Each structure stands twice: as C-alpha cells, then as structure tokens.
Amino acid sequence: EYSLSVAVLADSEIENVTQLTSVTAPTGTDNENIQKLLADIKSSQNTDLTVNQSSSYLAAYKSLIAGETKAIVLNSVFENIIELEYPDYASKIKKIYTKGFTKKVEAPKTSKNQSFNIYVSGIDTYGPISSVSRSDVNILMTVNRDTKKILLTTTPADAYVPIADGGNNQKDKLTHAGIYGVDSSIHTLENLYGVDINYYVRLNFTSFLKMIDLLGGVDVHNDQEFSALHGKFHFPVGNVHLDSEQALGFVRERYSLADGDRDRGRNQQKVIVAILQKLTSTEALKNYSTIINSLQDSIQTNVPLETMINLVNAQLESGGNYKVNSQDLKGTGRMDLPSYAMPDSNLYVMEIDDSSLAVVKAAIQDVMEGRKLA
Numbered sequence: 001e002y003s004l005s006v007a008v009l010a011d012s013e014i015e016n017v018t019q020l021t022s023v024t025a026p027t028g029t030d031n032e033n034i035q036k037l038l039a040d041i042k043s044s045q046n047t048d049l050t051v052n053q054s055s056s057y058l059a060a061y062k063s064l065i066a067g068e069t070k071a072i073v074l075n076s077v078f079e080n081i082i083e084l085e086y087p088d089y090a091s092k093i094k095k096i097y098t099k100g101f102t103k104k105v106e107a108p109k110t111s112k113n114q115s116f117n118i119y120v121s122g123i124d125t126y127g128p129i130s131s132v133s134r135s136d137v138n139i140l141m142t143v144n145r146d147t148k149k150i151l152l153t154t155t156p157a158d159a160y161v162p163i164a165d166g167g168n169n170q171k172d173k174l175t176h177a178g179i180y181g182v183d184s185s186i187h188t189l190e191n192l193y194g195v196d197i198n199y200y201v202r203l204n205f206t207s208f209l210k211m212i213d214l215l216g217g218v219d220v221h222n223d224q225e226f227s228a229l230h231g232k233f234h235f236p237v238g239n240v241h242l243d244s245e246q247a248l249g250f251v252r253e254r255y256s257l258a259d260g261d262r263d264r265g266r267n268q269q270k271v272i273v274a275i276l277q278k279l280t281s282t283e284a285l286k287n288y289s290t291i292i293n294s295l296q297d298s299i300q301t302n303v304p305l306e307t308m309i310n311l312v313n314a315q316l317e318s319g320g321n322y323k324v325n326s327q328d329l330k331g332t333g334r335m336d337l338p339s340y341a342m343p344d345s346n347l348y349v350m351e352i353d354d355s356s357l358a359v360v361k362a363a364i365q366d367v368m369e370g371r372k373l374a
C-alpha cells in the first residue's frame with residue numbers, strides 16, 4: 001500500500017497536472033511505477049508529460065526546492081528516504097495528483113524439507129505496526145525440525161551491504177532496507193547469506209511490549225551488570241525476570257556493555273530464547289489462537305495460519321526442547337564509506353569481515369543440512 005504523486009512547491013501557482021508539460025523523476029531506478037503514473041495521467045486527464053530524469057527521488061526533491069524544476073514525481077516510500085536528509089520536506093510541498101498502488105510483500109516459501117528460515121525484523125518506532133521506519137533488529141532464525149536445532153544469526157543494523165529492491169543493490173547500512181520495506185530487508189539478507197528466507201515476522205516497540213506482557217514476562221540469565229535507558233532499569237548478574245518495559249530496555253542498551261552492539265545482539269538472542277520457552281509451554285501451545293488474536297494487529301507476518309497450526313500441534317504431540325545456538329556477523333566500524341540513501345552525510349557503517357561472512361554462511365548451511373556446528 002503506497003502511492004505516487006505529482007508534487008510542486010507548497011506556494012506554487014500550479015493547481016493541477018494539466019498545467020504541466022514535464023515532470024522530473026528517477027526513471028533510472030523506479031521506471032515501472034513512474035510509467036504507470038504517467039499512463040494514468042494521460043488516460044484520466046489527457047495529458048502527456050515528458051520526463052526529466054533524475055538520479056533519485058532525493059535528487060528530484062533537491063531540484064524542486066532549488067527551483068530547477070516545477071514538478072516532480074514522488075513515490076511515498078521514498079518520502080521516508082528524503083526525510084533522512086530533509087526532515088521538514090512535507091511542509092515544503094503540495095501534491096496535485098495522486099495514484100494509489102497496492103502490492104503484497106513476500107509470499108511465503110514452504111520448505112520442501114525439515115528446515116526453514118524465519119527473518120525477524122524489529123522496527124525502531126512506537127505506534128501502529130504499519131508505521132514506516134528503519135529495521136534496527138535483523139535476526140535470522142534457522143530451524144531444523146528433524147535435529148531439533150535452532151540457529152540465531154544476527155546481522156548488525158549498521159552492516160554495510162548491497163540493499164535489494166528500492167536500495168538498487170547499492171551499499172548502505174542494513175537498517176535502511178527496512179525503510180524500503182520488509183521485502184527489501186528479506187532480499188538483502190537472502191543475497192548476503194545465499195539462502196531462501198521462508199517467512200518473516202515484523203514488529204516494533206509497541207508490538208514487543210504487548211508480546212512480553214501477554215507471555216507473562218520472560219526469564220533470562222544476565223552475564224554482566226548493566227543499566228538501560230539512562231539508568232531507568234538496572235540488571236544485576238544472575239537470573240532475571242523481565243516485564244515488558246524492562247525487556248525492552250534489556251534489548252535496547254548498547255553503549256555501556258563490555259562488547260557494545262555485539263553484547264546487545266547477544267541480549268536480544270537471550271530474549272528470543274526466553275520467548276521461545278514461553279511459546280512452547282503447553283498452555284501457550286494449547287491457547288495459540290488467543291495469542292494470534294492478541295497480537296495480530298501489532299505483528300506482521302507471512303507465516304500461514306496452516307503453518308502455525310502444524311508447528312504448534314507437532315510440538316504439542318512430540319514435545320521436546322530445541323537446542324538454540326547463536327552467532328553474529330562481524331565487521332569494522334568506519335565513517336568514510338558512502339550511504340546510498342543519505343549521500344550527503346557521513347554515517348557510521350560496519351564494513352563486513354569476509355572471513356566472518358564465510359563462517360556465518362557455513363553455519364547456516366550446517367544447521368539446515370543437519371550437520372554439527374564448527
């Protein structure tokens with residue numbers, strides 16, 4: 001659910017598209033959508049516009065505010081990209097023609113064998129799940145139902161990788177993929193790790209809170225004393241029970257941890273294991289429908305109902321615990337590499353360590369294939 005519009009400056013005398021002869025747009029990277037809009041304009045308004053190609057939607061916007069063009073095409077998805085460098089962009093423009101588009105995100109891929117991959121996207125925002133934002137949590141869960149093994153692979157938010165789809169396969173921090181959509185994030189990680197991602201789950205701060213509450217909190221073993229959210233929550237060494245708000249702090253704190261983002265990644269993994277322990281309780285399995293009802297409006301997923309039912313009932317009958325292992329893609333922080341989405345800013349990114357990538361890829365394959373980890 002997105003839209004393309006013809007936009008002009010807020011104070012432009014232009015009121016409707018029939019007054020235009022041309023429009024500036026990135027036909028180099030969004031030609032299909034753009035051409036649909038132009039065909040729709042020619043049909044309902046009998047107006048044929050020539051296109052002044054721009055290198056991107058950001059570039060088109062710059063041209064507009066610079067007075068170098070009268071009108072641009074704007075794909076709503078990319079308004080969120082423009083906002084990264086121009087937070088007040090919305091107030092600078094008006095829209096004089098709008099076309100709604102619709103697309104389903106990733107279709108689910110059913111695995112032909114005992115193993116599947118689920119991508120967990122954690123969005124940096126409160127409120128309705130439909131809110132567009134970057135994906136600061138990017139965890140792949142490789143599950144093998146035969147060996148009863150799970151592998152959690154964390155990819156840091158700042159990982160500098162080719163971003164698929166809207167990212168135009170250009171390098172940027174992984175978290176930006178989330179802005180283009182869950183599709184972009186999924187395809188980005190499929191390409192990086194060379195595996196099919198069967199399903200995804202997408203949730204934000206508000207979704208996470210409801211889930212923890214619903215489950216009655218979660219229990220973890222904390223390895224190092226730390227505090228989160230400017231000292232609001234304190235976590236001692238030892239077994240800790242986390243309510244919704246504590247758990248959210250627990251998975252967010254980074255800077256004060258001995259190993260920074262890597263330790264935060266491990267804390268997130270601890271919480272996932274704890275959630276899984278609650279979700280595979282007999283009470284939870286028996287009452288899965290209530291859990292679906294309770295979380296459906298705040299958590300997006302393409303896992304089919306039929307699949308959930310199979311997974312739940314299989315666990316109900318067979319019982320038995322999954323063993324969980326974890327890993328994280330390693331790299332080196334840098335300030336001198338360009339961000340495709342934010343070309344004018346110096347950003348911190350993590351340049352991937354190639355030897356680590358090889359190891360991470362091999363481990364995913366091992367668990368999928370039922371081989372022991374190195």
Ligand SMILES: CC(C)=CCC/C(C)=C\CC/C(C)=C\CC/C(C)=C\CC/C(C)=C\CC/C(C)=C\CC/C(C)=C\CC/C(C)=C\COP(=O)(O)O
Binds near residue numbers: 269312
């Ligand atoms: C289905 C069933 C009952 C059994 C199936 C059999 C088994 C054992 C496994 C099958 C797997 C299945 C079906 C489901 C697994 C899913 C599962 C158990 C748990 C899912 C956990 C989920 C959905 C989310 C966890 C994500 C998590 C830990 C945190 C979310 C992160 C969020 C929302 C925000 C983080 C943002 C962040 C890192 C920092 C905040 O930003 P700043 O403050 O600016 O720095």
